[PDB]
Write a protein that binds this ligand. Structure first.
Ligand SMILES: CC(C)c1ccc(CN2CCC(O)CC2)cc1
Length: 150
């Protein structure tokens, strides 16, 4: 019973979370996952400020109200060469990665590793936070509150 959560640098408190190395998070699980990091789904304004501080990914993820990819550099295989906060318009499917926003994080780029999952609850899952530099933090718990996400 294990969940891997790959996380990024934070940019103005915004960061990306990928579960189990695949697009696999529903919108309800995304809100619960951010809550386990004392975080919320970013607003579009919070994501735009994070982009202006240097944040970009090549993965679709939830924010409040939309599924997006923040892009700084045009790349043909990431949001079809667009820059800015690219918004997904048409898709058949419902599972993506998520973005999260922590108001207590530093105001600009924070590329230190994540070393805690502060607001997970009691549970039986081994949850492992995996940083881009490979460093890991594991704890036994749960974060999902909706049965259909388990
Ligand atoms: C296998 C067993 C040890 C276990 C332990 C804990 C849970 C999650 N737990 C369930 C009840 C909820 O009110 C809160 C979270 C599930 C299963």
């Amino acid at each position: 019973n294990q969940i891997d959560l790959n996380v990024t640098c934070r940019y103005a408190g915004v960061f990306h979370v990928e579960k189990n190395g695949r697009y696999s998070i529903s919108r309800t699980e995304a809100a619960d996952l951010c809550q386990a990091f004392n975080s919320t789904l970013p607003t579009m304004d919070q994501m735009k400020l994070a982009l202006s501080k240097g944040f970009e990914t090549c993965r679709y993820g939830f924010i409040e109200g939309n599924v997006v990819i923040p892009r700084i550099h045009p790349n043909a295989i990431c949001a079809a060469n667009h820059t800015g906060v690219y918004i997904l318009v048409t898709s058949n499917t419902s599972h993506y990665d998520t973005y999260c926003f922590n108001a207590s994080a530093p105001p600009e780029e924070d590329c230190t590793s994540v070393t805690d999952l502060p607001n997970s609850f009691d549970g039986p899952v081994t949850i492992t936070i995996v940083n881009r530099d490979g460093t890991r933090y594991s704890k036994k718990g749960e974060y999902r509150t909706h049965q259909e996400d388990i």
